[PDB]
Amino acid sequence: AAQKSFRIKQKMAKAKKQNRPLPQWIRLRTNNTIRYNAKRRNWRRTKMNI
Amino acid sequence: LKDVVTREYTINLHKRLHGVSFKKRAPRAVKEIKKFAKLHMGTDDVRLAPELNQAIWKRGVKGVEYRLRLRISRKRNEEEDAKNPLFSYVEPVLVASAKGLQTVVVEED
Amino acid sequence: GKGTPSFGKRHNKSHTLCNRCGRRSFHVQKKTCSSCGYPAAKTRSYNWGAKAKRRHTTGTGRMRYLKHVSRRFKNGFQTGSASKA
Amino acid sequence: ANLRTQKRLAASVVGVGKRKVWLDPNETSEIAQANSRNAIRKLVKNGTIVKKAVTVHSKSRTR
RNA sequence: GGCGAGAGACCGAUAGCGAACAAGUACAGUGAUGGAAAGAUGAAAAGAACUUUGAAAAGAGAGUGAAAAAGUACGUGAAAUU
RNA sequence: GUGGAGGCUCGUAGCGGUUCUGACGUGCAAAUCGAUCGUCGAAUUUGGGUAUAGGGGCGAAAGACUAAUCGAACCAUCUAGU
RNA sequence: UCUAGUGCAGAUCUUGGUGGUAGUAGCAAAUAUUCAAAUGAGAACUUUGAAGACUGAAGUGGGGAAAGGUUCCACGUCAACA
RNA sequence: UACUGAUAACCGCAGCAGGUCUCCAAGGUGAACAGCCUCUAGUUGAUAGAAUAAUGUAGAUAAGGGAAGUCGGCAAAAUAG
RNA sequence: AUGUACAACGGGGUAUUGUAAGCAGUAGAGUAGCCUUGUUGUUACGAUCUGCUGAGAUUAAGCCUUUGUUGUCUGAUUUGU
């Protein structure tokens, strides 16, 4: 909520920095087996449980 | 082909709306006016003036006037030529009382 | 209305995060984690929770010191430094 | 085009609601260029936006 | 169990550790706990210049390649079903 | 006349949940919708905090409730139980 | 010659996949939309203007707690979701 | 310390008619933050079009009689300030 | 597919309801005000009433009729003993 705690805000910031796609140069590298991100997280679908 | 004309008509919305739901009287009036113009001018493209829409929606949805006096203008088309070179422009005629009138032709002036 | 509307009434967290395990198991009104046993000294484990051990045990982390322990045993726990042959 | 936020900024600026603010369509390109409240104020000044004639509620019958 | 080495009449991706892959992962649950799926282009990206139709995606040509009856919905490519 | 009591009464919100054994009944919904009804200043309604934990609790007592689970919760193990 | 985790039509079998039903049931609560212009490839729904209506201050208004986490605002933008 | 606070931001597997604490509260009618209408504020959202058969659901009316119906006057009607 | 053609309008008829608006009135419960004081004095308010007014409005959407007005009347597909 608005009146929140710093731990919550810390985890939220980390989540926000996670919530974005792959880099395409990583898609370009050698021996690469990654096509997409699968740790992707959207507030509508799944909650953090914190 | 020809006939870039204007005319003035009269229409009986009462008999064209008799039996109709009270939340659709006016929209059906609009559709019936497009149909009226199609009949009387053989056009498919029919544009109605917002003045006319207001004159229909004046007394509301279920208060549409029994009669209406129209100024139709069969005109030539422009704008990335469509199926038809001709369309119709429907407009009102502010008359005090729209009873006892018969239809007439109207010229460019 | 034991189901849906009650789930609507459901909004106050019984559990929150713990500072020893980070798992959201810290019962506030008891002041205990349901997974590590905080604020107890020991770590909570059971030999019926074999999977739990396997999940929370040694090697699932960085082992910031313990890998180097075996390297150092190999080299015999030596002090000093090299000599530039 | 889309002028939602322009209408909203104008509402807040003038101090009325969006059901009062009026944007003429014949200056749509100008209003879409406009992005900031300063420009909205210029537009109100030059009359491209008007507050609006308030809807009347009369009390003659009651009196 | 831990660390390091070697082997097998063992399993060969619905098998074998739950996990051959960013697996105790995503995900669920208040929580304890639960707990997946998912391997293969080609020797080499040479991963399709250029033209044309189309709003574009794509198509038809062209071309690469031994092979596009290998086109990242990629080895082969069964059946049900179409 | 004054005054303005009451686990008084009519009746809103609010709390509930009688009847239609109505609608829906592969639903809006794993108990809802509509009308009709009960009560509505009190043994009232209710948030937050707090205590009570499984043969245990809590129960103005229905064997009711105890996280869509109760004539003894849920998790794992004993357990590939017989 | 040896050796087995050795032969499936079934087990309301397990996992995955596919169908007919079937272009079907159905997408019907919450009084309600219409005219033109602009954009754009394309407009029943996007934007504007005009009109008609609603919530009708115990409101579909304005602000907050719990919870949610960046949904806030902008620019671009429509393969998937709506 | 933004923002929603809910027929789309919470929980109900979801953009579910459910549920979830609260503050402010205009004019008229009327006893009344009842119901109806309106102003400020906000929405104009819920897949649409054309027809208007049976059957449905929701809503209404019906001569004369007046519970004979039915388990039962269920339901509706009358009553009403 | 150029005619006792068809339609949209208009007019007339038939029906329904019940006497429109507007104007006027020495109609009008009564009440104020005036001064030329009244010898109906007049001006203003005022539910309603009377006349013009069986008037006016509606009247085919599945009513009748038309000597009127204005329009329309060559698009597509298929078929052989």
Swiss-Prot record, chain A:
Chief place where the protein resides: cytoplasm
GO biological process: cytoplasmic translation
Superkingdom of origin organism: Eukaryota
This protein's UniProt keywords: Cytoplasm, Ribonucleoprotein, Ribosomal protein
Quaternary structure (record): Component of the large ribosomal subunit (LSU). Mature yeast ribosomes consist of a small (40S) and a large (60S) subunit. The 40S small subunit contains 1 molecule of ribosomal RNA (18S rRNA) and 33 different proteins (encoded by 57 genes). The large 60S subunit contains 3 rRNA molecules (25S, 5.8S and 5S rRNA) and 46 different proteins (encoded by 81 genes). eL39 interacts with YIH1.
GO molecular function: structural constituent of ribosome
Stretches with biased composition (Basic residues): 6-19
Region described as Disordered: 1-21
InterPro entries per the UniProt record, alphabetical: Ribosomal_eL39, Ribosomal_eL39_CS, Ribosomal_eL39_dom_sf
Record's GO cellular component terms: cytoplasm; cytosol; cytosolic large ribosomal subunit
Family, as annotated: Belongs to the eukaryotic ribosomal protein eL39 family.
Signal peptide positions on this chain: none
Function: Component of the ribosome, a large ribonucleoprotein complex responsible for the synthesis of proteins in the cell. The small ribosomal subunit (SSU) binds messenger RNAs (mRNAs) and translates the encoded message by selecting cognate aminoacyl-transfer RNA (tRNA) molecules. The large subunit (LSU) contains the ribosomal catalytic site termed the peptidyl transferase center (PTC), which catalyzes the formation of peptide bonds, thereby polymerizing the amino acids delivered by tRNAs into a polypeptide chain.
Entry's localization field: Cytoplasm
Disulfide bonds: none
Pfam family, one: Ribosomal_L39
Keyword Ribonucleoprotein: yes
Swiss-Prot record, chain B:
UniProt protein name: Large ribosomal subunit protein eL31A
Domain of life of the source: Eukaryota
Further details from the record: There are 2 genes for eL31 in yeast.
Function statement: Component of the ribosome, a large ribonucleoprotein complex responsible for the synthesis of proteins in the cell. The small ribosomal subunit (SSU) binds messenger RNAs (mRNAs) and translates the encoded message by selecting cognate aminoacyl-transfer RNA (tRNA) molecules. The large subunit (LSU) contains the ribosomal catalytic site termed the peptidyl transferase center (PTC), which catalyzes the formation of peptide bonds, thereby polymerizing the amino acids delivered by tRNAs into a polypeptide chain.
Short name of one Pfam family: Ribosomal_L31e
A single BP term in Gene Ontology: regulation of translational fidelity
Gene Ontology MF, one: structural constituent of ribosome
SUPFAM superfamilies in the record: Ribosomal protein L31e (SSF54575)
InterPro entries reported for this sequence: Ribosomal_eL31, Ribosomal_eL31_CS, Ribosomal_eL31_dom_sf
Presence of the UniProt keyword Cytoplasm in the record: yes
Family from the record: Belongs to the eukaryotic ribosomal protein eL31 family.
Predominant cellular place of this UniProt entry's protein: cytoplasm
From Swiss-Prot, chain C:
Zn-finger segments (C4-type): 18-36
Residues that, per the record, bind Zn(2+): C18, C21, C33, C36
SUPFAM superfamilies, per database record: Zn-binding ribosomal proteins
A biological process term (GO) from this entry: cytoplasmic translation
Signal peptide: none
UniProt xrefs under InterPro entries: Ribosomal_eL37, Ribosomal_eL37/eL43, Ribosomal_eL37_CS, Ribosomal_zn-bd
GO cellular component entries: cytosol; cytosolic large ribosomal subunit; preribosome, large subunit precursor
One of the record's GO molecular function terms: RNA binding
Cofactor annotation comment: Binds 1 zinc ion per subunit.
Cofactor annotation: Zn(2+)
Keyword Lyase included in the entry's annotation: no
Gene3D superfamilies assigned to the protein according to its UniProt record, in alphabetical order: 2.20.25.30
Subcellular location(s) per record: Cytoplasm
Organism domain of life: Eukaryota
Keyword annotations: Cytoplasm, Metal-binding, Ribonucleoprotein, Ribosomal protein, RNA-binding, rRNA-binding, Zinc, Zinc-finger
Function: Component of the ribosome, a large ribonucleoprotein complex responsible for the synthesis of proteins in the cell. The small ribosomal subunit (SSU) binds messenger RNAs (mRNAs) and translates the encoded message by selecting cognate aminoacyl-transfer RNA (tRNA) molecules. The large subunit (LSU) contains the ribosomal catalytic site termed the peptidyl transferase center (PTC), which catalyzes the formation of peptide bonds, thereby polymerizing the amino acids delivered by tRNAs into a polypeptide chain.
Additional information: Present with 21800 molecules/cell in log phase SD medium.
Family to which this protein belongs: Belongs to the eukaryotic ribosomal protein eL37 family.
Cross-referenced NCBIfam families: PRK04179.1
Protein name: Large ribosomal subunit protein eL37A
Gene: RPL37A
Curated annotation (Swiss-Prot), chain D:
Single GO MF descriptor: structural constituent of ribosome
Main location as per UniProt: cytoplasm
Keywords linked to the UniProt accession: Cytoplasm, Isopeptide bond, Phosphoprotein, Ribonucleoprotein, Ribosomal protein, Ubl conjugation
Cell location: Cytoplasm
GO cellular component labels: cytosol; cytosolic large ribosomal subunit
Chain positions with Phosphoserine modification: S29, S36
Record carries keyword Phosphoprotein: yes
Cross-link (Glycyl lysine isopeptide (Lys-Gly) (interchain with G-Cter in ubiquitin)): K20, K52, K59
Bias type Basic residues, positions: 58-63
Biological process (GO), any one: cytoplasmic translation
Annotated family: Belongs to the eukaryotic ribosomal protein eL19 family.
Subunit-level organization: Component of the large ribosomal subunit (LSU). Mature yeast ribosomes consist of a small (40S) and a large (60S) subunit. The 40S small subunit contains 1 molecule of ribosomal RNA (18S rRNA) and 33 different proteins (encoded by 57 genes). The large 60S subunit contains 3 rRNA molecules (25S, 5.8S and 5S rRNA) and 46 different proteins (encoded by 81 genes). eL19 lies in close proximity to the binding site for eukaryotic initiation factor eIF4G.
Additional remarks: Present with 97700 molecules/cell in log phase SD medium.
Stated name of the protein: Large ribosomal subunit protein eL19A
Species this chain originates from: Saccharomyces cerevisiae (strain ATCC 204508 / S288c) (Baker's yeast)
Gene that encodes it: RPL19A
Residues of the full protein shown: 2 to 64 of 189
